[PDB]
Amino acid sequence: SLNSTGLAQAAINGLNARFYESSNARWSSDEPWWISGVALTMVIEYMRRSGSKEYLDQVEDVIEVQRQPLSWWPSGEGEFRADATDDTGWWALAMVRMYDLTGNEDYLNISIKDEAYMRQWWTDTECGGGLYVDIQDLTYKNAIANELYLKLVASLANRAPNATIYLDRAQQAWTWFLGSGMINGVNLINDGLARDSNTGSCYNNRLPVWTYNQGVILGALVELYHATKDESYLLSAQAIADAVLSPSNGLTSSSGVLTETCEGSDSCNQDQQVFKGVFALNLAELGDAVAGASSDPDAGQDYREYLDTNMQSMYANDRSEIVPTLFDSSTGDLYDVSWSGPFRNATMPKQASAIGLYVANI
């Protein structure tokens, strides 16, 4: 009764009608630049899963303009190399998807440049590995920057020419992530690592458990399996996803609705408004991998059911439509942060996360 393809296209059109800036080939310049890359990922993935190409022209426009040297980080020399390794990671993975959609080697080359760039801040001398997120300061090895990097080298191991060096890098990277301690006692991932003032050893800093730090790692473990056929990577990804699905861990509501930790206090900032959809998309990649690796028809049924349960809740309770005019005949759908709570406002990060859930069900 619910077409995930029709509703994704409607949410994409709502994203464009309210937040796309033709003058700047970017969505919402008042919102973080990296969230435009998350948005590009969702539009690229919609097209990759629905066989459609309606936004291909728009996507290429964004790519060409955001390719250029960033005004706030000229030293990066463009090609999405920014002042933060996670900012670069989001665009790099969007280019892996651009390559998956079009087959154009140009986008794969961007991802290779981005990996070499991010690897510049991998050090074995602190925490025994991992990279920093703050390229200027180098004081925080967190979860998202390392998850993004891990999925980049894992992705290149399946696509890039010198796959071997990327497979060795991805295997050594997952090993570091596993032993870092960021995966806690319930198989969830806190925000990052803290470092001992005296001993220099690193530990889980017990900062909040964000939804997207439970998703990007799933995509990485999926790609790590497609490059090794070692189902052990899938089982690790299933442990993380299963913990997100358990309501005892606080991320899944009693209704079965994914709930960001900030939604209760209504303090979800521009970053946190987009987290959920990144997880959903990555969970759909896990569910797809689990069902293909096993003959059981029920393989990945829980992950599919979860995405379906969350999509109907976001549709019924979180949706709003745009008012068409005699001048603007633009149509689509708008969405708020709470996939169960009421629609009050729509922001571009909230919109990108909604698109991600619909695309996760295509």
Ligand X SMILES: OC[C@H]1O[C@H](O[C@@H]2[C@H](O)[C@@H](OC[C@H]3O[C@H](O)[C@@H](O)[C@@H](O)[C@@H]3O)O[C@H](CO)[C@H]2O)[C@@H](O)[C@@H](O)[C@@H]1O
Q: For binding to ligand X (CB under 6 A), which residues are involved?
A: 139-140, 192-195, 205-207
Provide the 8-state DSSP code for 199: T
Compare residues 13 and 142 and give the one whose CB is closer to ligand X.
142
Which tokens is 94 given? 């969007």
Compare residues 205 and 253 and give the one whose CB is closer to ligand X.
205
Give me the least distance between CB of 284 and ligand X, in Å please.
30
**Contacts of residue 65, Cβ cutoff 8 Å, sequence gap at least 6:** 24, 25, 26
Compare residues 209 and 359 and give the one whose CB is closer to ligand X.
209
Compare residues 80 and 275 and give the one whose CB is closer to ligand X.
275
Compare residues 140 and 343 and give the one whose CB is closer to ligand X.
140
b/e code 66-76 from CB counts within 10 Å (16+ = b):
bbeebeebeeb
Give me the least distance between CB of 251 and ligand X, in Å please.
19
Give me the least distance between CB of 200 and ligand X, in Å please.
12
Which tokens is 216 given? 């990007």
Give me the least distance between CB of 207 and ligand X, in Å please.
5
Give me the least distance between CB of 91 and ligand X, in Å please.
22
Give me the least distance between CB of 214 and ligand X, in Å please.
18
For residue 299, give the amino acid letter: A
Query: What is the 3-state secondary structure of 176-217?
Result: HHHHHCCECCCCCECCEEEECCCCCCEEECCCCCCHHHHCHH
Spatial separation of the C-alpha atoms in residues 119 and 298, rounded to whole Å? 39
Q: Which residue is nearest to ligand X (CB)?
A: 194
Compare residues 39 and 193 and give the one whose CB is closer to ligand X.
193
Give me the least distance between CB of 134 and ligand X, in Å please.
8
Spatial separation of the C-alpha atoms in residues 235 and 220, rounded to whole Å? 13
Residue 147 and residue 216 in contact, taking contact as beta carbons nearer than 8 Å? yes
Give the DSSP letter string of 232-294: HHHHHHHHHHHHHH-GGGSSB-TTS-B--TTTTTT---TTGGGHHHHHHHHHHHHHHHHHHH-
Spatial separation of the C-alpha atoms in residues 162 and 316, rounded to whole Å? 47
Compare residues 57 and 196 and give the one whose CB is closer to ligand X.
196
Spatial separation of the C-alpha atoms in residues 28 and 46, rounded to whole Å? 20
